[PDB]
RNA sequence: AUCGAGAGG
DNA sequence: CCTTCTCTCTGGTCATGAGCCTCTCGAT
DNA sequence: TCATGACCAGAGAGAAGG
């Protein structure tokens, strides 16, 4: 129903905003290079995790 | 580093030591040319490089429609007409920092905040 | 008359294609919740526009109804099976 | 795909002649340190020289192709940040209208 | 971890640093070669303090390495450890000094010394030999860690 | 009104015009027409000339090529036009003939037959490229 | 056009990733052992090292690529003129120089030209290939993608028929010439050759002349599927 | 895709389908989904022969 | 018994051994594959019983 | 019989 | 030092293989 | 087609001599 689709699309929009925030944070070299992986790897993992969270 | 050649043969010069005066000379092995060194640096080897990250910046950059236009202003001329791209360097451990080029004054600036060089 | 142009794979690496001519309309809500979600173009330096995105399909897949609502392996399977359906192959 | 067509093959000689008559400096007269910001020019994967101010050349070539004075199935690619201009009249390249 | 020594990420990090392989190449930024014949004074205005703090108690070719702060801090490494490792490598066949952890730049200055004729005069080896020495320093210098363990992660 | 921008519906018009001029197998037909009109002659004029030296010199060279319309030679019969339906029924090969202009020069000849080339249907040498829908029906070919 | 035979030029960076001796050698068609690039350049009439590097590094303020090229010049230092470069050749005196001269215009970059007196174009193109190689080795440009469609060509009916017809016409010509040799004291054109070869290829789908392996391309010609119109 | 500007690490640019099968996929989403499903088809094609050799 | 030269016997042996080999095994390192009529490789006793379609 | 192509689960 | 031998890991070419079963047609 | 053990001469470590 309408309410549920509204909540779904708002969830997807908030996930998109989360990914945008992480991307801009990475663009300013403000990423913590945690041990054992590059910055790009951390960024990719964060974005993939966010999108899977949103889908589920 | 720089590189110099013999004026007569146009072949590369090799370092030699003027032992008695402790001088640095660049000699040729084609002819008997020898010149005075203008820099003590003889060999540089970068393992981490910032060269080529802004490669391929030509004045016609504004006519590449595949490149994205941002909304930032130029620190020099304050023109919001600018393009940007990520580091052209293709090493796997490369910062995801944006380089902007102004379409009004050809000035290259950066989204980086942890440092600001060149 | 310079209205349509042939583009190969190497050339389109230097262009920015639009999906619909509506992407050339100026932007300035009450959207149908049933319509699919189309993101804004967020690109303006267009050089070409697709004739119709449905032209990315072949002969077989062009028979499928609503292939945009199907898991893609099912579309592959249907493209494989349509070549085995019975019918009038030629009038003569 | 439906609108997918395939290149048939064209003669490159008129293209090269038109190049050499519109500022495409030949390769033996290419002074790299005296013309550093020069765009290389390829015709079917063969380097035929360099060219300066290639935006005008690219506009002229696209105007000719969109007119018919060049075979529409010829591909003309200006890579800017690489300073290259590659022209293919090869046979067997897959294209589509736009 | 050692039985009972679990639930202590301090010793966990210590073991991780002790086991993860670390080469000299992983911390170097650039490796330069200069002709710097005067030991008491360098042509480089930056290394002055380095030789100024060197007054306690060869070859004019200088091999100068710059190190990355991020690579030194992601690990637990001080310039003294790197210097002691490079000195342990060649066993007095070259002179080595370095900067301190407080300076804006992390530098290591090395010179060659031949025992036969460099103890009485300043004879210079072929600069082609310092290239091979730099190759051995960047490829065959084991700072710490173990042979093939090129990465270590702490998990709970 | 004349210069107003198009909509997504009008695109279909263009698509229609695309096929009314190309059909669906334009690739095959264009490749084969290019092969017959141009490539064949180039292959013929490539190192064609032959030289034999005795004490004189005899030279044999090939000139322009000619590609007939598809015909067929019946044994105990004569050459006559071959249409596709007859080829598919009689297990024939819808091939036309090749004739080269050969000339013999000496030191200090008419058209010659070299073989038959199979013809792609609806190419510039196929009888159906110029055929009307009614002509197709009379030739027992599906439009 | 003509004999579309393939010559595979390989410019190999023999230096390992972290090792020294970053030499750059080249593979020549009829030459056993790889050849350093500077010897090939001086064989092409480009003697000075500065001119060689100008043919490779198209910018003066690019010292990384030039420093990469130093071992090549130190490798080719032993040869300093053109005839000495041509003398470095793999065979079983003066004939080796001519063999090298012939290879450098017949088998070396034949797509450029096979006419003698065009060494500048080939030298510049070799420098271009070396520049691309070093742009890759310096992690400045990414490895060339192989599955990019623009690098792919679709041989359609035209090219396949041409590949077959060139062979068939060559066989016909050889038969005609052998007949002329056989007719030294006295129209003998077996048209069955061309027709039969074309029909065999178009029927069996084996694109060749009664061969199995040399005509490894099988299934080129297939029975038209007439089950349904869309099929 | 040539319909995106260069260096676009956006969710939709790199294969996130925010629509449902019920709602319908966009052309870019369609192509990315087909690209993903082809990988599964190829894995199903190859793992069969590999597992056949293993079982034998 | 004809009194042949010393190196025509070389040819006789290079043919006899080759034929006996190809009759035993036709696919070997020697580039000659002993093609039969119509360019077909001669089926050897080895390949006769070797393989999934083989005898065993 | 061989060789090959296409197709099904 | 330097040979000289006596076994030595070290470097390289080579053989070998690649899912069952089933259907149809086509050319020699 | 192509990766990968399984091999199998040649350069190559020591010990022993010289
Ligand atoms: Zn000189
Ligand atoms: Zn500005």
Ligand (nearest to CA of B6): 1
Q: Report CB contact under 8 Å: D6, F15.
A: no
CATH number, domain containing residue B83? 2.20.25.10
Residues of I in contact with G212 (CB under 8 A): 39-41
d(CA C81, CA G230): 11
Q: Check: CB of residue E80 under 8 Å from CB of residue E133.
A: no
Cβ atoms E146, E85 nearer than 8 A? no
Torsion angle defined by CA atoms of residues E77, E81, E82 and E87, in that order, rounded to the nearest 10 degrees? -170
Helix (H, G, I), strand (E, B) or coil at F140: coil
Residue G185 has phi, psi (to 5 degrees) of -135, 5
> Where does residue E64 rank: exposed (0-12), middle (13-18), buried (19+ CB within 10 A)?
buried
Radius of gyration (C-alpha) of chain H in whole angstroms: 16
Resolution (A): 3.0
Q: Is the CB of G199 under 7 A from strand K?
A: yes
Q: Name the closest residue on chain B to residue D59, using Cα atoms.
A: B63
Identify residues after which chain G is interrupted (C–N over 2.5 A): 92, 186
Helices (H) and strands (E) in chain G, counts: 8, 3
Closest CA to E26 of E95, E64, E77: E77
Q: How many CB atoms lie within 10 A of CB D57?
A: 21
G226 touches strand J (CB under 7 A): no
- Which structure tokens are listed for G98? 């001519």
Distance (Å) from CA B113 to ligand 2 centroid = 19
Vertex B50 angle, CA B49 and B51, to 5°: 95
Q: Could you tell me which residues are beta bridge partners of residue B16?
A: B25
CA H35 to CA H39: how far, in whole Å?
7
CA-CA distance, F88 to F84, in Å (whole number)?
Answer: 6
- Chain G span 65-94 residues with beta carbon within 7 Å of strand J: none
β-pairing, E142-144 vs E22-23, is antiparallel
Cβ density class I5-41: b for 16+ within 10 Å, e for less: eeeeeeeeeeeeeeeeebeeebeeeeeebbeeeeeee
In chain C, which residues are last before a break of more than 2.5 Å from C to the next N? 28
* Protein CA G231 to sugar C1' K18 (Å): 33
State whether B65 and B55 are in the same domain.
yes
Minimal C-alpha gap between F142 and chain C (Å): 5
- Is residue G109 within 8 A of residue G122, CB to CB? The reply is yes
Kindly list the residues of chain C whose beta carbon comes within 8 Å of any beta carbon in chain D. Answer: 2, 4-11, 13-14, 17, 48-51, 55-59, 62
User: In chain F, which residues are followed by a C-to-N distance beyond 2.5 Å, i.e. a gap?
Assistant: 55, 108
How many whole angstroms separate alpha carbon C45 and alpha carbon H4? 11
Partner-chain contact C9 G228, CB within 8 Å: no
Which of 3.90.1110.10, 3.40.50.170, 3.40.50.720, 3.40.50.1370 is the CATH number of G1-145? 3.90.1110.10
Query: Distance between CA F110 and CA F114 in Å, rounded?
Result: 13
- Rg of chain G on CA atoms, in Å: 24
- The number of beta carbons lying within 10 Å of the beta carbon of residue B5 is 20
From chain G, pick out residues whose CB is under 8 angstroms from the CB of E131: 20
Residue B103, domain extent: 46-118
Copy the structure tokens of residue I37.
């009529």
Phi-psi region of I20 (alpha: psi -120 to 50; beta: other; left: phi over 0): alpha
Residue located via tokens 């040399």: G214
Q: Are A50 and A22 in contact (CB under 8 A)?
A: yes
- Indicate whether B24 and B74 sit together in one domain: no
Chain E positions touching chain B (beta carbons under 8 Å): 25, 28-38, 43, 60, 68, 122-124, 127, 131, 134, 138
Q: Are residues B22 and B59 in the same domain?
A: no
* C84 CB closer than 7 A to any strand J atom: yes
Strand J reaches within 7 A of the C81 CB: yes
The SS3 of residue I4 is: coil
- Report the separation in Å between the CA atom of B23 and the middle of ligand 1, taken as the mean of its atom positions: 20
Copy the structure tokens of residue B24: 């640095």
Tokens found for residue D35: 């013309």
Residue corresponding to tokens 């980086």:
B112
Distance G45 CA to ligand 1 centre (A): 18
- Please tell me if residue C7 touches chain B, with a CB cutoff of 8 Å: no
Measured CA to CA, the distance from residue G226 to residue G174 in angstroms comes to: 41
Distance G59 CA to ligand 1 centre (A): 22
How far apart CA G196 and CA G165 sit, in angstroms, is 11
Min distance C36 CA to chain B CA atoms (Å): 26
Do the beta carbons of residue G121 and residue D28 sit within 8 Å? yes
Mapped onto helix, strand or coil, the DSSP state of residue B100 is strand
Residues F119 and F92: beta-carbon distance below 8 Å: no
Six token digits for residue D67: 């007119």
Q: Which domains does chain D have, with CATH numbers?
A: 9-90 (3.90.1070.20)
Q: Given B58, B63, B88, which is nearest D83 (Cβ)? A: B58
Strand J: positions under 7 A of a protein C-beta atom? 2-9
Nearest residue in F to C25, CA atom? F5
CA closest to C1' of J5 belongs to G219
Within this chain, do residues B33 and B72 fall inside the same structural domain, yes or no?
Answer: no
Token pair of G81 as six digits: 């003129």
| C-alpha–C-alpha distance, residues G143 and G157, integer Å | 33
- For residues G167 and E129, give the distance between their C-alpha atoms in angstroms, rounded to a whole number: 60
The phi, psi pair for B75, rounded to 5°, reads -60, -25
Q: Is G192 on the interface with F (CB under 8 A)?
A: yes
Phi, psi (deg, nearest 5) at residue G8: -95, 105
Exposure of F80 by Cβ count < 10 A (0-12 exposed, 13-18 middle, 19+ buried)?
exposed
Q: Are residues B41 and B57 in the same domain?
A: no
By C-alpha distance, which of A43, A26, E66, E67 is closest to B114?
A: A26
- C-alpha I56/C-alpha I52 separation (Å) is 8
Could you tell me the distance, in angstroms and rounded to a whole number, from the CA of residue B41 to the centre of ligand 1?
21
Q: Residues with Cβ < 8 Å from A44, sequence gap 6 or more?
A: none
Chain K footprint positions (protein CB, under 7 Å): 14-15, 17-21, 25-28
**Phi, psi values for residue A12, rounded to 5°:** -65, -40
Q: Which of B45, B61, B76 is the last residue of a domain?
A: B45
Closest CA to G133 of G24, G18, G27, G17: G24
Q: Which residue has the tokens 């048939």?
A: D8
Please count the structural domains in chain B: 2
Q: Is some CB atom of chain B closer than 8 A to the CB atom of A29? A: yes
Q: Do the beta carbons of residue D87 and residue D15 sit within 8 Å?
A: yes
Q: Which residues of B are annotated as a binding site for Zn(2+)?
A: 6, 9, 28, 31, 74, 77, 102, 105
Orientation angle between helical segments C72-82 and H27-55, nearest 10 degrees? 80
Answer whether any strand K atom is within 7 A of the Cβ of I54: no
Please state whether C69 falls in left (phi above 0), alpha (psi between -120 and 50) or beta: alpha
Q: Which technique was the structure solved with, according to the deposited record?
A: X-ray
Q: Which domains does chain E have, with CATH numbers?
A: 11-144 (3.30.1360.140)
Same domain, B52 and B76: yes
Q: Please answer whether residues E126 and E117 qualify as being in contact, where contact means their C-beta atoms are separated by less than 8 angstroms.
A: no
- Distance between CA I46 and CA I38 in Å, rounded? 21
Joined together, the tokens standing for residue B48 give: 């981490």
Between chain A and chain C, the number of residue pairs with CB atoms below 8 A apart is 4
Q: Residue F106 in contact with residue F58, Cβ under 8 Å?
A: yes
The Cα G126–Cα E92 span in angstroms is 47
Residue H36, φ and ψ in degrees, nearest 5: -70, -45
For residues B73 and B115, membership in a common domain is answered with yes
Collapsing DSSP to helix, strand or coil, D79 comes out as strand
CA distance A21 to G172: 73
State the best of B23, B47, B48 to mutate against chain E, taking most chain E CBs within 10 Å.
B47
Euclidean distance between the first and the last CA atom of chain I, given in angstroms as a whole number: 45
State the DSSP H helix or E strand holding residue D56, giving kind and residue range, or none if neither: helix D54-65
Residues in chain B with CB shorter than 8 Å from the CB of G140 are 52, 55, 88-90
For chain D, report the end-to-end CA distance as a whole number of angstroms.
14
Which residue, among G178, D85, F135, has the nearest Cα to F143 in the 3D structure? Answer: F135
The β-bridge relationship of strands F50-53 and F57-67 is antiparallel
Tokens of B108: 């290259």
């Amino acid at each position: 129903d309408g309410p549920t689709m509204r909540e779904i699309t708002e969830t997807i929009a908030e996930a998109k905003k989360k990914v945008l925030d992480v991307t801009k944070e990475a663009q300013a070299n403000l990423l913590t290079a945690k041990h054992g992986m590059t910055l790009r790897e951390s960024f990719e993992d964060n974005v993939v995790r966010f999108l899977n969270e949103a889908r589920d | 580093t720089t590189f110099r050649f013999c004026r007569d043969c146009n072949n590369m010069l090799y370092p030699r030591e003027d032992k008695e005066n402790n001088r640095l000379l660049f000699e040729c092995r084609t002819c008997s040319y020898v010149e005075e060194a203008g820099s003590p640096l003889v060999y540089r080897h970068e393992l981490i490089t910032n060269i080529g990250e802004t490669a391929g910046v030509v004045q016609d950059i504004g006519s590449d429609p595949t490149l994205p236009r941002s909304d930032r202003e130029c620190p020099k001329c304050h023109s919001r007409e600018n393009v940007f791209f990520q580091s052209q360097q293709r090493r796997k451990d490369t910062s995801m920092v944006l380089f902007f080029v102004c379409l009004s004054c050809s000035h290259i600036f950066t989204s980086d905040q942890k440092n600001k060089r060149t | 008359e310079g209205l349509v142009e042939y583009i190969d794979a190497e050339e389109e690496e230097s262009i920015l294609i639009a999906m619909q001519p509506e992407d050339l309309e100026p932007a300035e809500l009450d959207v149908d919740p049933a319509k699919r979600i189309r993101v804004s173009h967020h690109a303006t330096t267009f050089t070409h526009c697709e004739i119709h995105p449905s032209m990315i399909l072949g002969v077989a897949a062009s028979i499928i109804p609503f292939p945009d609502h199907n898991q893609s392996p099912r579309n592959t399977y249907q493209s494989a099976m349509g070549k085995q359906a019975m019918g009038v192959f030629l009038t003569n | 795909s439906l609108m997918s067509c395939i290149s048939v093959g064209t003669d490159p000689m008129p293209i090269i002649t038109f190049l050499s008559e519109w500022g495409m400096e030949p390769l033996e007269d290419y002074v790299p340190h005296q013309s550093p910001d020069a765009t290389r020019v390829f015709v079917n994967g063969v380097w035929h020289g360099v060219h300066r101010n290639p935006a005008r050349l690219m506009e002229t070539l696209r105007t000719l192709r969109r007119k018919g004075d060049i075979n529409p199935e010829v591909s003309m690619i200006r890579d800017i940040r690489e300073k290259e201009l590659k022209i293919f009249t090869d046979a067997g390249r897959v294209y589509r209208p736009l | 971890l050692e039985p009972g020594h679990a639930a202590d990420q301090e010793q966990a990090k210590l073991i991780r640093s002790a086991i993860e392989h670390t080469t000299l190449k992983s911390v170097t930024i650039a490796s330069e070669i200069y002709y710097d014949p005067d030991p008491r004074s360098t042509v480089i205005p930056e290394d002055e303090e380095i030789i100024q703090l060197h007054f306690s108690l060869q070859s004019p070719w200088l091999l100068r390495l710059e190190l990355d702060r991020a690579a030194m801090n992601d690990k637990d490494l001080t310039m003294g450890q790197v210097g002691e490792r490079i000195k342990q490598t060649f066993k007095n066949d070259l002179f080595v000094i370095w900067s301190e952890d407080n300076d804006e730049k992390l530098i290591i200055r090395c010179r060659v010394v031949r025992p036969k004729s460099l103890d009485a005069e300043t004879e210079a080896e072929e600069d082609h030999m310092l290239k091979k020495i730099e190759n051995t320093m960047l490829e065959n210098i084991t700072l710490r860690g173990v042979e093939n363990i090129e990465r270590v992660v702490m998990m709970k | 009104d004349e210069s107003a921008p198009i909509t997504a519906e009008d695109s279909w018009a263009v698509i229609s015009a695309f096929f009314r001029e190309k059909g669906l197998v334009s690739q095959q037909l264009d490749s084969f027409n290019q092969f017959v009109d141009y490539t064949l002659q180039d292959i013929i004029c490539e190192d064609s000339t032959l030289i034999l030296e005795q004490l004189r010199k005899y030279e044999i060279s090939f000139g322009k090529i000619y590609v007939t319309k598809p015909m067929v030679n019946e044994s105990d019969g004569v050459t006559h036009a071959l249409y596709p339906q007859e080829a598919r029924l009689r297990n024939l090969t819808y091939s036309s003939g090749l004739f080269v202009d050969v000339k013999k020069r000496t030191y200090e000849s008419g058209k010659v037959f070299i073989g038959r080339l199979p013809i792609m249907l609806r190419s510039k040498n196929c009888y159906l490229s110029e055929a009307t829908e009614s002509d197709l029906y009379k030739l027992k070919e599906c439009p | 056009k003509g004999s579309r035979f393939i010559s595979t030029l390989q410019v190999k960076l023999y230096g390992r990733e972290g090792s020294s001796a970053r030499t750059i050698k080249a593979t020549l068609p009829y030459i056993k052992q790889d050849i350093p690039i500077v010897i090939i350049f001086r064989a092409l009439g480009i003697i000075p090292d500065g001119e060689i590097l100008e043919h490779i590094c198209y910018d003066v303020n690019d010292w990384q690529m030039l420093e990469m090229l130093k071992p090549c010049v130190e490798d080719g230092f032993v040869i300093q003129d053109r005839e000495t470069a041509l003398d470095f050749i793999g065979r079983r005196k003066e004939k080796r120089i001519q063999y090298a001269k012939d290879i450098l215009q017949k088998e070396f970059l034949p797509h450029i030209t096979q006419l003698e007196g065009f060494e500048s174009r080939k030298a510049f193109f070799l420098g271009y290939m070396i520049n691309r190689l070093l742009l890759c080795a310096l992690d400045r440009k990414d490895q060339d993608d192989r599955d990019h469609f623009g690098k792919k060509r679709l041989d359609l009916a035209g090219p396949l028929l041409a590949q077959l017809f060139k062979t068939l016409f060559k066989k016909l010509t050889k038969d005609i010439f052998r007949y002329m040799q056989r007719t030294v004291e006295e129209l003998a054109i077996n048209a069955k050759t061309i027709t039969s070869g074309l029909k065999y290829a178009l029927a069996t789908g084996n694109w060749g002349e009664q061969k199995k392996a040399m005509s490894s391309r099988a299934g080129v010609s297939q029975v038209l599927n007439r089950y349904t119109y869309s099929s | 895709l040539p319909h995106f500007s260069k260096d676009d690490y956006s969710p939709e640019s790199k294969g996130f389908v925010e629509n449902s099968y019920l709602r319908g996929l966009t052309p870019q989403e369609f192509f990315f989904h087909a690209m993903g499903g082809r990988e599964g088809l190829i894995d199903t094609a190859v793992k069969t022969a590999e597992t056949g050799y293993i079982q034998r | 018994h004809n009194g042949a030269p010393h190196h025509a016997i070389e040819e006789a042996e290079s043919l006899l051994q080759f034929h006996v080999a190809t009759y035993m095994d036709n696919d070997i390192a020697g580039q000659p594959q002993a093609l039969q009529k119509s360019g077909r490789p001669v089926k050897s006793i080895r390949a006769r019983l070797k393989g999934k379609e083989g005898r065993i």
